Write a protein that binds this ligand. Sequence first.
Ligand SMILES: [Cl-]
Ligand SMILES: [Cl-]
Ligand SMILES: [Cl-]
Ligand SMILES: [Cl-]
Lengths: 392, 392, 392, 392
Amino acid sequence: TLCSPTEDDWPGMFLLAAASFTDFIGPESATAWRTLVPTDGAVVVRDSEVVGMALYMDLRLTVPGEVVLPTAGLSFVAVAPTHRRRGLLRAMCAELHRRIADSGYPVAALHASEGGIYGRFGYGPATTLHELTVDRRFARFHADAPGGGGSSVRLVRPTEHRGEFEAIYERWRQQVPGGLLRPQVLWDELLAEAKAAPGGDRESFALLHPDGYALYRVDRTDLKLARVSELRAVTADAHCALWRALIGLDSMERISIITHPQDPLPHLLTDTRLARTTWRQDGLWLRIMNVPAALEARGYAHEVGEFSTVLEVSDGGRFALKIGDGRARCTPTDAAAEIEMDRDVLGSLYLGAHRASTLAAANRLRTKDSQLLRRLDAAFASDVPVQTAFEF
Amino acid sequence: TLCSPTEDDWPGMFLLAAASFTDFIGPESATAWRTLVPTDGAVVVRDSEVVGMALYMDLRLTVPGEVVLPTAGLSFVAVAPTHRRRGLLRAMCAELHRRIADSGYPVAALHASEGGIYGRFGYGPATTLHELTVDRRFARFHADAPGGGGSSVRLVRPTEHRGEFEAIYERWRQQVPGGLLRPQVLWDELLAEAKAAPGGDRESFALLHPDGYALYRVDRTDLKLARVSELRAVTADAHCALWRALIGLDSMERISIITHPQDPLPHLLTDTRLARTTWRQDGLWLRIMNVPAALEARGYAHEVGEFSTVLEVSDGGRFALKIGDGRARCTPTDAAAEIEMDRDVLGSLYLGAHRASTLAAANRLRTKDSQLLRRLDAAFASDVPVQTAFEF
Amino acid sequence: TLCSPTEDDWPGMFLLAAASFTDFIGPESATAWRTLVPTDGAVVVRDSEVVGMALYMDLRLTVPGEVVLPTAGLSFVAVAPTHRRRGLLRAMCAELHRRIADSGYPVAALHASEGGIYGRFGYGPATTLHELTVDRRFARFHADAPGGGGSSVRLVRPTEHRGEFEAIYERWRQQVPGGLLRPQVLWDELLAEAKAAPGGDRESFALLHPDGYALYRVDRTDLKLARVSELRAVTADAHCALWRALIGLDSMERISIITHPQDPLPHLLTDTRLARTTWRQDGLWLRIMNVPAALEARGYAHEVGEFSTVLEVSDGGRFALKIGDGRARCTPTDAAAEIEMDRDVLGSLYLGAHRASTLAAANRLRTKDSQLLRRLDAAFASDVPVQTAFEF
Amino acid sequence: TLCSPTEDDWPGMFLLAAASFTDFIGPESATAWRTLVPTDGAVVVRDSEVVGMALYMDLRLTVPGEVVLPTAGLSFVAVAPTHRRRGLLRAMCAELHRRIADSGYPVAALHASEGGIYGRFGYGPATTLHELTVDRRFARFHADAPGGGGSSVRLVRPTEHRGEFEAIYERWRQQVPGGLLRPQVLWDELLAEAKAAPGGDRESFALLHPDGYALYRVDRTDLKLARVSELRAVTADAHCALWRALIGLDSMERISIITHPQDPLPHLLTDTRLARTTWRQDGLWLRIMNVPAALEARGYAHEVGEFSTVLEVSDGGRFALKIGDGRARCTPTDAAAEIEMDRDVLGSLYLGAHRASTLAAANRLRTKDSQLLRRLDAAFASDVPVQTAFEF
Ligand SMILES: [Cl-]
Ligand SMILES: [Cl-]
Ligand SMILES: [Cl-]
Ligand SMILES: [Cl-]
């Protein structure tokens, strides 16, 4: 049977969690994340022990046009290894989606453990994780790079500058598509992870600028690699200044960061090739819950002239879509469809990370008009490049 | 001293080549590539032995709008290890650029051995190489993917279907920015490399469709890896059909290809994550020789409304640039600059591989108007994604 | 500005330390090492936070002839990654050298994080670290090797035999060039490191002989490798007996030790090749602060007949150097130089680790007389091979 | 039975060779090396097939004092895997040593396949192979390094400059202890190996100076490693000039060379640590056949004053040894021994690669007088550092 969990169910859920997630944050930390789950935000399957669970958290997601949407963040999704191929995932996703839609969320979001699961439930990959590794021994800043003229950056202990990190992040998340509000409990969690653990991670340090910060630590095993866990810069000056400081970590051979495809770091160096892409993966996945609410909520490129089309989402409705002056109107119609796509495809287009033209070339997006394709491409494009905030 | 080489100089140039290039194609093959070098296309430095050399080949490069430009392809550039830090590279590049400009080439192009060299001579990286590795054991085609309904693809010996490869490639290179005309000597060279070599590469096979081909071989050392040397598809149907056949290589674990960032392959699969980005690097580099000729020659996005600005290229002139109805007019002016950039930056923008906004964020492109930045971004964008033809 | 640190500065110095040194011993241990730093032995740069620091400790260094010199041991040298290329290192080294020279130290010493830094400040590499790895499964002792006839060696817990280790080390450090006095705080530190740490190093064991000891532990990750942290032997009998016991660690495949190039271990085995050199690096670096005081203080080889020359140290003075009966007299002169060298070169010659002839072949040491070169080589040679005591 | 081989035996010897030596040069090349084997220079054991073989070649070895000794070079030593532990090696070594001693050779020499075999037959390791790997991307020459002011070095094809290589090598081998005369057949062999082989080694190049040459090739598998097979420099200027050219191989990450422990290369660089010791091994092994002839033939250090002692070689005679003015007189005596050592130990001392003091510390060399030890150390030391010529 499928139920909202009682307080009695949570020890059983933590057991399933520990057995399902190698990166399980543990019961103390999980209890803190729990404060972000609304009443009726969780489902469990009992056989009595917990053999399936899924929940969503109340999130705030920034989309193009600096618009902030209420977002259901799916998380803590697990089926017991004893109960595979019994349709438990489908049943739990159907119930949560029912609750999320009824609660009035226009979008749901998740981070996927595997890439093959969530497409069939209407989730499309919406942000791209891009790992850059810099061999900092060869790194020289271009003549054009800002801040090559005191340093504005300070090396600090993260726990002593929480207020400054919170304020910089709050500015960042409001101006960048993919930005998430980071509540106080997640700041508590982040700064507890900044601590060195015996047999675990090394101490984290911060580089602090008025308009940016970098959190980094030396890798556990590779003592010549510094991993930047987080760099939030609100200005180009802040971004360059922080990278000048990171390239100044003279005891390291390599600096690595999980960033976005449009990170300007390579262009700050005389040799763009030194900032090597070592890893690429889907970041945030989006399911558009309400097509017209979602399409009307975001801003569109002003550079494209007013145009009208008919969009059909497979079992998601058909809409007269009019885009002009950076705004969309999206109304019901029975007029012939000019564009067809599955719900997951719309999620992938929504933050501007994937081009309509690319999805059309894979036949994930069907139209008979190449002009309409170019107009969609241009309109859905994001002025500010889409980034990934934090994993949940 | 710096001279055009005589026939007597070429053995000395082949020695320097063998000592400079681990992938040196050898004197027979080098003599065939020589047929693409015009009279006065080569310079040598003698100390008497050859201690420096550089040449350019007559190429035809496709740019956005399906426009074909005469292009000087720099190649075979080497300074003897005995004559480093003597300004030989600067002297040879200055002389060839003089000859290329005087001959009336609007653009020069090269493939860079290192990323830190050619920026200072006005070359910007203009295409992006993107290696995808597919674990084909898990690869399943999406319900939406074309051609899941006889097969239109044939497994053939490359040497027996030269005419068909030539015709498909000729269609491809004319419609794709980054496309190069492949002369008969380079078809001779390609199909000679398709042969198995004792102690060297394994036999190459071809997958042939009416509207595409793939050339592939099993890796020398990794016998569970097939490397696609070349996939040219003129239709989405051809692209999907060829990938269905490659995923059908049941004796392989992995298929790898050097492609472009907008390759739709990931979107053909139920799990987009199976097409892993394993390597990323600059491909073709461009030096704009004549700013107004180059800017007027290419097509621009129709989606952006007519706009005017003043572009200054650092020691490259200042121009009144008017872009409307997908065309540019670029005339001399002494009016105040609204946009400033080095010549290399313009090369990087020219085929639409890099966004003005990204280069602006690194301060490689200076303007005080963010609206102008969005308009440049939109205008210079390529409808057909930029690809890399063949290395030279 | 550049100041001696107050008690308030030390938390800021520990932050810079933690961020600069992956092997940072932590504030408790650093506070113990602090007891070896004299009043005015430390400098800091403030921007207010600590952005640069450097100090020296009062050490006692054994040089050829069993002569013990007061030595300034430079340590804890760091510039913040935010303040690179601002001349902070040069400023801090200039001030400490001023204080060290004025305090009457004839020599300064350090261990170098990188090999390219300290040459320009007059430091030359003076000892050579030589890692030997023995595949002990094949190791058989030569018929000639001592102690192949009860065992004189005991397997003990290090913490229970501190008095015996202290007494053996005190005998060792007084008879070996490179020997350092090990104060009580460093014995406290060493025997605390002998403990097993959860997620860290395994338990240390000791092999104890009347005239030697070995400290060893099994490697964290490679459980078939025993690492000898320290072997101090005052007699050849002790050295051989300890190696017989180490080769008796039948659960190990390999024994590794960081020793000196003249370690006789290879010659104790029937197969000298079993003691493989797996790593070689500069150990102790010396800056001669007072040329005449340093040259007069050490003993010279008795085998070379009395000779006189004129030595010029680049911006270090010119001296009439007379060496006879194992003693040097070194007096000011304006007579023509017969030998010229930078100060760093003299440091490299001083403990007999590097031959004048080898440095002459690199033109680091200039003379027009090859007989003088042979005489310098012979005179500066050390009867007892130079070893490295402990890192600081 | 044990016989000198007939012409009929050599096919059987080549079979045993092919099965015994993974680096077997093949019958053509082996037939060329054969020209260096004197009449009665070879023994075979037949069971009829060849189950054991050993031979010596007529060599000329340079020893300290630029003295050239006739030397029996043992080579091509093999016992069939079917005939191990049957005393065939002992029987063949006894017969060849009988023939070598009777023929009037003062010394025999070999390169050892394993380090544990040849000690018991009186061979001691006499030279040390020292592999240096330079990360040439970081390598900068010291201000003091010669030739930092045209280049005197030429990049050439080895086969076109045989005369120049022969003349430089002939100068080198006469002035360096360990030097071997390289006959014309071995020059034929060397320049045939300079060729690229299909599925094998890449093409060899030469760097040619009036007073030195380097032979190098790119590694088969590691295409960023250049291996210097041979560098012969007669002057410090030649040595530095050749290394400036090798560091100029800008397509390589690393240059490796098998050199000697006193190679001045590290001291030519601003960072001595960049020239990393990656491998160390015994090179040439010596068996002193006639103790008095060998000890009287070499020159001794002039810096040590005249001294007399009594040397006993274990089953090798007892001698009154008087060393003065760089010469030794070595006459029979029954006077009490002051120094005792096995024959192999004398071989190890003979070229100055190993110190008497080091061998004494392993009890391989016994005396009750530490003054005598220092005098032996000083006297047997080589002014010109011992190098290894070519493997045989
Ligand atoms: Cl991101
Ligand atoms: Cl491509
Ligand atoms: Cl040591
Ligand atoms: Cl050598």
